[PDB]
Amino acid sequence: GNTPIDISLSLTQFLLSEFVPGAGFVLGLIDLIWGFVGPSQWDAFLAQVEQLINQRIAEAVRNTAIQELEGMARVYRTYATAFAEWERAPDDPELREALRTQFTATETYISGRISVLKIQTFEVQLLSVFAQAANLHLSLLRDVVFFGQRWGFSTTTVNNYYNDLTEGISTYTDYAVRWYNTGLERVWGPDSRDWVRYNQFRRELTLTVLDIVALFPNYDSRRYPIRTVSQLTREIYTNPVLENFDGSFRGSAQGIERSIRSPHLMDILNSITIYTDAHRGYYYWSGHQIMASPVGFSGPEFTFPLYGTMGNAAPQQRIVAQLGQGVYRTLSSTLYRRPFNIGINNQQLSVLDGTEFAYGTSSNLPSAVYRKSGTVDSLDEIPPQNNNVPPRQGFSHRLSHVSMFRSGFSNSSVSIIRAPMFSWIHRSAEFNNIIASDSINQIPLVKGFRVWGGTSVITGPGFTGGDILRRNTFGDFVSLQVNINSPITQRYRLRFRYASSRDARVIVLTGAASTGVGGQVSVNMPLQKTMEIGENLTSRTFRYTDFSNPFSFRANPDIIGISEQPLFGAGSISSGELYIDKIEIILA
């Protein structure tokens, strides 16, 4: 089993860590995807979303798509070797000229024939190979913008390729998120079964499409002259009780989706205290409590409201999640009791009767076990990024929350449903905000610890790899905690990635005060209007500041605050919205 979900996760790992242009990058794209000779690989890629919504692609359209993929891999392969021979004698004017034509030949082939992956009425099924190919096209355009003057191309030829890269990022992004959403809505229905297949689409295409799409902007090598590491803070969802049910509870799907928490700052799951109930010698997970900390463990634990019902047929069991790299895997045992319809006191049960919590770790640390283990295995839906090493080392996601979809009390109620919902954040969403020397640091604003009043966390547009922050008025956004590995004397610069339907002014303060409240203004920067009032959030509505003017922190676990300030003379009324996604920090 080498699923497309497997391949795509290892590719997410590659792009996230070793994003820097050179032979290592080309050799890497060959090894993970484009080295494959023949059709079967692309056949599997299409099959996954095809059987997901149970519509196969028309065969003429399907085979042309597969054969153009083959040709794309095939022209890239010859570019890649021509690239390597050049990097072995980089000044030779003949190797240069040989790479220059083999580049323009391969770019024209890929550029021109992506079309066959955007075919009308088959947009969703073709989405995952389109994401692969758009990502391949962008690798090439980054290459010329970065190596143009070494290769021998004119500065005018390169500036045109650069505009292609710009537009490519914006066009490809917008197509993918558009067909992601319309494919999602088409799967939605009102039943337990309809929600399962809805969520299956969301999860698989978040892994196979959106995560590669979130990294496209890093292909802009004029905007990112050096290394940069993005962070995927979005959470994908599993539910063993519902995903393993053979029937379907009717009209539930709207109730299930609401039981997921609303957009929120990123937290670190600390512990889960499970409560047990019983009925007729059948013991089950009836409710639980969740405790979390902010990013950086920057202060006091938050305890979530009770999930489910606080049973006592056994004593509570407190499972600590946050050991090593967190819980990477759950193996649950489901229990569906179907009696000969007695009722109320001979109940119908749709619940969990055990779960094993497996730790992500380079160690022998044993799993946590509630009652007993099971065979409903989350690793089957959230696979490893590296199958060459044991799962506890090559895992892709860490457990981030546990909610519950509840129905009935044990009371009356002929029927009881306790369906715990497991949230998975991608591994790249680090526990701390660490400012690296030597790279371009991305800190999504969802990594702060406090949202100030009148800033909302809004579900992200689809290409930021997480949620974002909105203000309707001017005011304070977040406070977040930063760690430097430099003397406090070291100087830094800062830029924003924002969306705004108005002009505004943005400031970053750096006097600490845990809780946030303090601060001294260190950075003052303008935000030009990026969209019209009431427009939708597409990639063209997002903009980068310049870098900021050197500043320094004033503590080494520092507490910085972001606020948006009224422009002088504007009269203190603000109309439109302000969106901030990311701040990025560099050195010197």
Residue numbers in the entry: 53 to 640
Task: Give the published text.
Two new chimeric Bacillus thuringiensis (Bt) proteins, Cry1A.2 and Cry1B.2, were constructed using specific domains, which provide insecticidal activity against key lepidopteran soybean pests while minimizing receptor overlaps between themselves, current, and soon to be commercialized plant incorporated protectants (PIP’s) in soybean. The two new chimeras adopt the well-conserved structure of 3 domain-Cry proteins. The high structural homology at the level of domain composition and folding supported the hypothesis that the two chimeras function in the same pore-formation mode-of-action as commercial Cry1 proteins such as Cry1Ab and the chimeric Cry1A.105 that maintain specificity to insects and have a long history of safe use (HOSU). Taken together, Cry1A.2 and Cry1B.2 represent two new proteins with toxicity against many key lepidopteran pests of soybean, with distinct binding preferences, that could be deployed with or without currently used insecticidal proteins in soybean.
Cry1A.2 is comprised of domain 1 from Cry1Ah (M22-D272), domain 2 from Cry1Ac (T259-E461), domain 3 from Cry1Ca (I467-D616) and the pro-toxin domain from Cry1Ac (E626-E1189). Compared to other Cry1A commercial Bt proteins, Cry1A.2 exhibited >50-fold greater insecticidal activity (LC50 at 14.51 ng/cm2) against SAW compared to Cry1A.107 and Cry1A.105, while maintaining significant efficacy on other soy pests including SBL, VBC and BLAW. Cry1A.2 exhibited no significant mortality and low to moderate stunting against CEW and OWB. The double mutant, Cry1A.2(E99C, R144C) (henceforth Cry1A.2-DIP) was identified using insect diet bioassays. The disabling substitutions highlighted in sphere for Cry1B.2-DIP are A160N and N176D and those for Cry1A.2 are E99C and R144C. The 2-way DIP competition assay results across all targeted soy lepidopteran species support distinct receptor preference of Cry1A.2 from all other insecticidal proteins evaluated. According to our DIP results on SBL, VBC and SPW, and the improved SAW/BLAW activity of Cry1A.2, comparisons with its Cry1A parent scaffold suggest that the Cry1C domain 3 of Cry1A.2 should be a major receptor binding contributor for these target insects either on its own, or via a receptor binding epitope nested between domains 2 and 3. Also, Cry1A.107 containing Cry1Ac domain 2 is highly active against OWB and CEW while the Cry1C protein and Cry1C domain 3-containing Cry1A.2 lacks significant activity on the two insects despite the presence of Cry1Ac domain 2. These observations are consistent with the hypothesis that the combined receptor binding domains (domains 2 and 3) in Cry1A.107 and Cry1A.2 target at least partially unique receptors across the insect species tested in this study, suggesting that Cry1A.2 would be insecticidal to these target insects even under a future Cry1A.107 resistance scenario.
